[PDB]
Design a protein around this ligand. Structure first.
Ligand SMILES: Cc1onc(O)c1C[C@H](N)C(=O)O
Ligand SMILES: Cc1onc(O)c1C[C@H](N)C(=O)O
Ligand SMILES: [Zn+2]
Ligand SMILES: [Zn+2]
Ligand SMILES: [Zn+2]
Lengths: 258, 258
């Protein structure tokens, strides 16, 4: 009956509302994905319940245990019926779950503390004073791990061996490390969120260079789910109507602090 | 079973090779989609024949007969097994055919001669001296037809009633019209092509302003096709391998002549 939506607490997609403690259910959260979830449900005609993924991860398969974690995992093991989050459409994930066409287009990028002498990935690879890393269990980390491109492979070879760890558990943790490391730490994260942070006080971070790749986020459902077809048509319908662009402007730029 | 591939002669996606005269079959053509078709065929393990869409159209549904034309029509009516072309993933099309995840990200844009006083869509809508139109039977013409957004809607009302016709049969016709119109004609087409033409002699056109939307091109197969699954995963693999980006630079900028 009520569709269980797995999502992640990640600003500006899903965030705890100001006085959420005084509210119930879906009304406790606000964000791009909360707005989208409400629309996807309206158009597909289903009641739903927003839920925050238990392990706070996007989703990766543990080689060896072979168990999927994050939102991907909740879909795979049947804990949730659908995932509405900034979840990247990738091959290893599409092999175990279904994705609608993209609702947002983006790519990996470099976030620096303003003033950092770095202008590209090539710059990062060619040096060592400035450490750099990615978010722990997801598509960005897999991108470098699986890359055959010289620059990206050089970066992986360093990152995978760097001590202490250059990987962070969450985006907030990477942004903080960037802000606190006095230009000695750069962060590899998707452009959508790099751009978001660039507009939030203290306005001390910046996105540099072009995107490392081009890809998208999709609404995910368990393989062979009944919701798949309709959510995909809903996504296409809503993008064509301009809602998705309207929502990015709302959560990114209208609410800009810089 | 040799796979019949429907595609369209559209630079730099598919073009007749210089020495096509004494060449046969697939060898007669070259371009981004020619390499892409070879790549996907390789990964999906099938033999194929490139064939040019008979009516030279991307694909639109006649409102009276409800009959589909273009590459979409060839797929719907079983004249082709797969379409490998710069074909845009849209709702009306996704309803009759299947599309893999995007192999290219893009958006509708504005092509001006060069030196013409137009900075954006808003500019076009506020004047009458400079005529502007789109290509027929495709997603761009649909974008404006079904657009509730003030500027785009206003633009449609002008283009629809326009006399003479501001719509063109092919992208080649639109580019020629912009080039010969002494800046009195602006063309609405996708960013991918706008940026391609911008890098080709006589170097007299230019893309102005940002894209009007964000979408993607997908490899299309007829509903319930056996090829669907594999081609989708192959597209994902190729994008992640970095091949699509390799192909983009090859046919767009390495060959750039401006
Ligand atoms: C959001 C976000 O931003 N940078 C990132 O790596 C992520 C996580 C990424 N979207 C994933 O699905 O793994
Ligand atoms: C290519 C291209 O470039 N501008 C355009 O309108 C098109 C056609 C568009 N890709 C379609 O599928 O109709
Ligand atoms: Zn709605
Ligand atoms: Zn290959
Ligand atoms: Zn007719």
């Amino acid at each position: 009956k009520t569709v269980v939506v797995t999502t992640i607490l990640e600003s500006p997609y899903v965030m705890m509302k100001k006085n959420h403690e005084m509210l119930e259910g879906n009304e406790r959260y606000e964000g791009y994905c909360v707005d989208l979830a409400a629309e996807i449900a309206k158009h597909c005609g289903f009641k739903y319940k927003l839920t925050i993924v238990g392990d706070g991860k996007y989703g990766a398969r543990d080689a060896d245990t072979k168990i999927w974690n994050g939102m991907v995992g909740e879909l795979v093991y049947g804990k949730a019926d659908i995932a509405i989050a900034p979840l990247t459409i990738t091959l290893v994930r599409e092999e175990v779950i279904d994705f609608s066409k993209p609702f947002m287009s983006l790519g990996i990028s470099i976030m620096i503390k303003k003033g950092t002498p770095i202008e590209s990935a090539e710059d990062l690879s060619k040096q060592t004073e400035i450490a750099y890393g990615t978010t722990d269990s997801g598509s960005t980390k897999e991108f470098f791990r699986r890359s055959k491109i010289a620059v990206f492979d050089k970066m992986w070879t360093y990152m995978r061996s760097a001590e202490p760890s250059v990987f962070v558990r969450t985006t907030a943790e990477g942004v903080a490390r960037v802000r606190k490391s006095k230009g000695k730490y750069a962060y590899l994260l998707e452009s959508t969120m790099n751009e978001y942070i660039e507009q939030r006080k203290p306005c001390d971070t910046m996105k540099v260079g072009g995107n490392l790749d081009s890809k998208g986020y999709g609404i995910a459902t368990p393989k062979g789910s009944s919701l798949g077809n309709a959510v995909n048509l809903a996504v296409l319908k809503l993008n064509e109507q301009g809602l998705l662009d309207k929502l990015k402007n709302k959560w990114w730029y209208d609410k800009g602090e810089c």
